[PDB]
Scaffold this active site. Structure first.
Site, mmCIF file in Angstrom:
data_model
loop_
_atom_site.group_PDB
_atom_site.id
_atom_site.type_symbol
_atom_site.label_atom_id
_atom_site.label_comp_id
_atom_site.label_asym_id
_atom_site.label_seq_id
_atom_site.Cartn_x
_atom_site.Cartn_y
_atom_site.Cartn_z
ATOM 1 N N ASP B 126 -5.629 -26.755 -32.556
ATOM 2 C CA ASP B 126 -4.703 -27.862 -32.362
ATOM 3 C C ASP B 126 -3.755 -27.957 -33.556
ATOM 4 O O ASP B 126 -3.551 -29.037 -34.111
ATOM 5 C CB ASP B 126 -5.446 -29.183 -32.134
ATOM 6 C CG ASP B 126 -4.556 -30.331 -31.674
ATOM 7 O OD1 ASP B 126 -3.410 -30.071 -31.236
ATOM 8 O OD2 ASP B 126 -5.009 -31.485 -31.772
ATOM 9 N N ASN B 131 -0.958 -32.766 -37.338
ATOM 10 C CA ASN B 131 -2.280 -32.412 -37.835
ATOM 11 C C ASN B 131 -2.170 -31.767 -39.217
ATOM 12 O O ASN B 131 -3.137 -31.182 -39.704
ATOM 13 C CB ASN B 131 -3.014 -31.512 -36.833
ATOM 14 C CG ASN B 131 -3.579 -32.279 -35.655
ATOM 15 O OD1 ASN B 131 -3.846 -33.475 -35.766
ATOM 16 N ND2 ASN B 131 -3.798 -31.599 -34.539
ATOM 17 N N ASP B 144 -7.581 -31.680 -39.681
ATOM 18 C CA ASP B 144 -8.029 -31.915 -38.315
ATOM 19 C C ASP B 144 -8.439 -30.593 -37.668
ATOM 20 O O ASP B 144 -8.108 -30.313 -36.517
ATOM 21 C CB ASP B 144 -6.987 -32.698 -37.510
ATOM 22 C CG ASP B 144 -6.786 -34.132 -37.974
ATOM 23 O OD1 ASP B 144 -7.281 -34.479 -39.064
ATOM 24 O OD2 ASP B 144 -6.144 -34.900 -37.234
#
Ligand SMILES: [Cl-]
Ligand SMILES: [Cl-]
Lengths: 247, 262
Positions: B126, B131, B144
């Site tokens: 992701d 992030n 993250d």
């Protein structure tokens, strides 16, 4: 429905529980609000607005109110009824409680859900973590429509993804158990995957120590194998109010 | 070593990040600034959680946001992470001002981090500007990863989806084939986020229309702040065939070359 962020004053970063945080503000110098962000690109601006309109027409004292939205900047933000005592689950674990107060908490939620049922609006994720507590100790349902759960799900949802008012009824039963267990996690000796298996084979939550036979009967009625033989939120509210009369 | 006593946390504060974001700040043992993040309850076993936390704590690189430890002795579980003063990279791109050399520096930072992760066969899954975090010196670090099962206060439709389609290659959207090459793709989109100063990819497309667009061979436009060479690099990340996308090592080489050519 649309909000100008210049009508927000007294912006603060407040603590909730031990390590939680909330973005607080005042809307039009009267309403206490929490400000929450919408995930970018998770839905169209069309889909967002229509859903926000449905949600703003959902008006009940035991629903956490959505006051409006702001779509004129990125990200989109929503402003919601501020709830001083925070998450119900955290609230159950911290505090103290008389059994009358626990049943009062169940009534609050049942009222909210009765209302939603009357509007044919499915919550889909009812649980203690999705209820909030205000300064007076009143419990209100939140995280409906816009949201951020095997252990709260009936067989037909786990197997077939069949959501209905009756799958909300099931979740409500588990929420009652959360309340009467003072915030234990359901099926805590099982993993998510083991829970799904064992539920299909007929596992149910034990009667919490603080719950009476009558209280257990009510939450247990929510967990009938057949969805159509589970009660309505109206029936549940009747049952709860009767037990209040007796208790 | 992995476990944390919450009494070693001092100077607890609730800080603002961006316009409406919030961070729980603390000091760990009076020598580390930390952010405190909660883990979503019952999302994994206590076994699964700890093994993953151990993997994550062995991931040590200066451009990765460090996980300092976990506390599992209360509900919910919380983690403590390297505090990053300038907050989310996406918010950072939108506020400020930037020279093009600074934008490429941001890409280098992230590419270093991802090169490291690739060397450890650890998939991010992701990667995006939302992030990445920025410290006080303006250094960008990837965050993250591993635990994304962090309690998030971002909202979506309960009917809609929260899957990062706009950062995902065809093989992920179609077959859920995650690899280092799906991270490579995401990195390309992150480069575009950086050079567009924080635009959302495929802004006038829905998630489904985005998937269709890519299937036709079409890709995100060249941002005006990106040079031909810079665009070639981000574009190389979006090859239809995963095996013909470069590695993070190759990308870092390409980035460093473009830096030389001031
Ligand atoms: Cl206040
Ligand atoms: Cl109990």
């Amino acid at each position: 429905w649309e909000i100008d962020p210049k009508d927000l004053t007294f912006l603060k970063e407040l603590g909730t529980g031990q390590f939680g945080v909330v973005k607080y503000g005042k809307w039009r110098g009267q309403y206490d609000v929490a400000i929450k962000m919408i995930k970018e690109g998770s839905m169209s601006e069309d889909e967002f607005i229509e859903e926000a309109k449905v949600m703003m027409n959902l008006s009940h004292e035991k629903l956490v109110q959505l006051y409006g939205v702001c779509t004129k900047q990125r990200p989109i933000f929503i402003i919601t009824e501020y709830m001083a005592n925070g998450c119900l689950l955290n609230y159950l674990r911290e505090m103290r409680f008389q059994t009358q107060q626990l049943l009062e908490m169940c009534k609050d939620v049942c009222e909210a859900m009765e209302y939603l049922e009357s509007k044919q609006f499915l919550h889909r994720d009812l649980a203690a973590r999705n209820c909030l507590v205000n300064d007076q100790g009143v419990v209100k349902v939140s995280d409906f429509g816009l949201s951020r759960p095997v252990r709260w799900s009936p067989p037909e949802v786990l197997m077939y993804s069949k959501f209905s008012s009756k799958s909300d009824i099931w979740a409500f039963g588990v929420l009652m158990w959360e309340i009467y267990s003072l915030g234990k996690m359901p099926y805590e000796r099982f993993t998510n995957s083991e829970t799904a298996e064992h539920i299909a084979q007929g596992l149910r939550l034990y009667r919490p120590h603080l719950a009476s036979e009558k209280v257990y009967t009510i939450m247990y009625s929510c967990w009938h194998e057949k969805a159509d033989e589970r009660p309505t939120f109206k029936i549940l509210l009747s049952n709860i109010l009767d037990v209040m009369d007796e208790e």
